[model samples]
Target: MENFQKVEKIGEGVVYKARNKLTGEVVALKKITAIREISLLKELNHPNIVKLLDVIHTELYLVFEFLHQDLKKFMDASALTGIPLPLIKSYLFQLLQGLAFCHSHRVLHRDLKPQNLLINTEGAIKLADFVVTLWYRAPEILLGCKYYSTAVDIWSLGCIFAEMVTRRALFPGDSEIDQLFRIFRTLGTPDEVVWPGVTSMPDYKPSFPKWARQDFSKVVPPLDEDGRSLLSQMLHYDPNKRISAKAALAHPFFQDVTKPVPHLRL
Candidate 1:
């Protein structure tokens, strides 16, 4: 507490921006009760992932490098003029890189949304936070699938990727059922052909309404064919069929983003 001065509270009062008194550095002090989160962040080392700098065990606050804003705030500020295509590609590339690293380490970021992505003025985006939110949750989880997979993160990336372009949530459902139906209405209701054993899932029922898929390009104009293709694979009905984070980085949509990704060490 003597080493850092609190600046302001952020993110539902758990996170606070603090200034390092000794080094004059601005960082985030996250008051977390779960030690597992500390372990997870300690093990993850990648350019696109948030860096945990120090841990204050006495007060249970996790210190992290502070970024200027979250993706949600970034998009909100750009609401009048949506995010540029090239910028979207850059952010998407960084996001995939971070997710890929997490997957490589066998870590599943069950919660992935714009709010959980931190960005700096240099255009670097880092994955932050963990905890599922209904708006960005994958269909399988919504359907009550107990055995979730890394594919769930990909589904969330799909939603965040789309939201980056449109500046709005891809599926803003009020409830669990509504969220599932929204996904179905946009991507078509899955059947045995699309997702084998989906009908037998804990929550699946034959009585659910059938909705046909819509054209991706039509839904998000200016999203090139390559972008749409990657988005489709990420949003695949079957978790087994969805694109992996590493594979998504190799997708054609990111080919033009030639910038080599970088990393941080703490």
Candidate 2:
């Protein structure tokens, strides 16, 4: 504690980055000042999920394997034309693998944004900031629904990749409604006919513009044909129809990835 260096103070001062004095190892230091995700963290045991190296509840500090800046920060600063296709595949695969494990365990991660996903120099990805992501309530969260689902999670992950390729937030809306409008306008508004149950959730009747779906190439120009296909499914109107993180493990775009579980046919 005495020899630790503060890298940055994030969110209410409970979360921060610290460097070890003796071994020179760096890890994310999380304080249990708020809703401590101890159970979720303990339940989550996967390579892609941030590793829990140490935890002390009495004093309240959790140590996790440190990662580089998040996909959001890395995308914002650099003027990169596009993210490497192979690298994107790797990161997205690891993401799906981790998410699949969680979903199979019946865990609904309400917050699956790019800012919460971490990236390291080796191009590894870890789904971190679990507590922080849960802080903001989703619609179902606001409505306080007991259990739920979304095409939004996969679609949201796609946006992270879209940001990597475009060097900008694909849809950084001003307000909740404002950003959702951005999604509706950017991607053609969902018509009940195409999406089947576009507004499956009772209270979700978006009165947004009726725009046309743009070309996939322009949407994420660098994405390959298969990559585009995967993204297309993510951006689907129906929650059940959306390409699940687990299901994506079988997508042909991930030709290089191994199949721990078989590909699920849609």
Candidate 3:
């Protein structure tokens, strides 16, 4: 911790360009406040996840493999020409693949906005930041529940998908309550049948005057039929009905991806 030199500040953490005293290899280090939740990082290992090389145990600081830039930075730079559809599909597929791996291991990356997704030089996408949430959490968490699973990550994935396609967040809410309404406005409020336990949620309360359901045609004007269908499955209001990350990989949207594979690697 004392030997590492700070290189630049990145997002909520300080980035450092450092040399391992023993090996002398250049590496990036992130200094973060110590939190018990960080232990989650120890259990995660996947190609599309930021690697945690070591942890300095002075009650603070976490060292991670320094990524050059995050997805947000890449998107900003690429926006000059508008992102190509094929590239978008490729990135989306990789993002889902990463999420699927996380879910398989019983992890939920509750905060999955674009900023948390890191991109490497090879144009590979890695889902980073595995912090757990206790407040202002997803619906399942807010409902006085502890049995929540990886579906929360899928919800975040859906939000990311919308953001990527539209160049803006589909549900940019100021608060948890506001977030639900934003989603409802776009996807329509879930009924009892569609979301069985919705009414029993700890914070469950009805909002929104009766309004006509949004037409997919207007909600996502740029998407073709296949694209829209895939998004619909991902953004389904009912968590139960929401498609699993693995199931989404099989969607027809990637039908033309490539031979022996439904999607091309980005």
Candidate 4:
């Protein structure tokens, strides 16, 4: 921490600029204290994802790749005129590509919010802060059920997409029950066929017995036709019906994506 200069503080991490002692190349660094989750960072390797430079371990410190800035900053500077339609298209496509790679490798970026996406000078978007199960944490885990999967990551991606278009959260609820209702209002409440064993889950209790039967359109008015269609496929109340990250990439929304490649620089 002494050798590097603190640039700015964003979200849960600190950014810095430092020179390598061996090669003397200036590099960016992110200092975090989640040592136990280091393995998840080590497992992530994708062009569209931030590169994890050498991990420095001191008596009580951890260092990560220094990224330029996050998506939130970029969106703000870009004038927020709804993220330019074409650019928005590209950004979402790249996000899906990176997410597909992560899910393919069994990695779940549980915290899939705009603040976590990093953009460098080249306009390349990199998914940063792969904090292991942090992004994939679900209410089930809080209820003592340990088994979970990439579905949690899918949920976050859906939320991210909604944020991108609306410039606000899709489901901002004060509690887990409210969160589920927010989602249900948009996607329609799940039925027994759609979400089997949902009620059996330890924390499963109906929060909106009446709201469960409400229409999805009234709940999510900001989402337009295209947005609604895409959101429906993503924000499935049941994890089982949720589209896979790779399948989501194949969706028509990305039909004009740059080369249909996993990681394409804009």
- Which prediction has the highest TM-score against the true structure? 1
Scored by lDDT, the top model is 1
Query: Candidate 3, residue 34: CA error in Å?
Result: 8.6
lDDT of 4 at 117: 86
Estimate, for each residue in 40-154, the C-alpha lDDT of model 2 and write its tens digit: 5676788778787777556377777887567666555455444555666777888888888777776655677767787766557777755333212333332224555744456
Write one digit per residue (lDDT tens) for candidate 1, span 111-183: 8888889887667899987533588889999888999999999999899888877778899988899899999
Instruction: For residues 126-217, write the lDDT of model 3, one tens digit per residue.
Output: 88767432222345654444666677777777666666676666666676666666666666666676678777776666653443468776
TM-scores for every predicted model = 0.92, 0.77, 0.84, 0.78
What lDDT does candidate 2 reach at residue 197?
A: 48
* Poorly placed runs, candidate 2 (over 4 Å): 1-13, 19-26, 32-37, 131-146, 199-202, 205-207, 257-266
Evaluation by TM-score, superior candidate among 1 and 2: 1
lDDT of each: 0.85, 0.66, 0.68, 0.63
**Clashing residue pairs in candidate 4 (N, C-alpha, C atoms within 3 angstroms):** 28-66, 29-66, 110-135, 110-136, 111-135
- Candidates, ranked, TM-score: 1, 3, 4, 2
Error of 2 at 128 (Å): 0.3
For lDDT, candidate 1 versus 3, the one ahead is 1
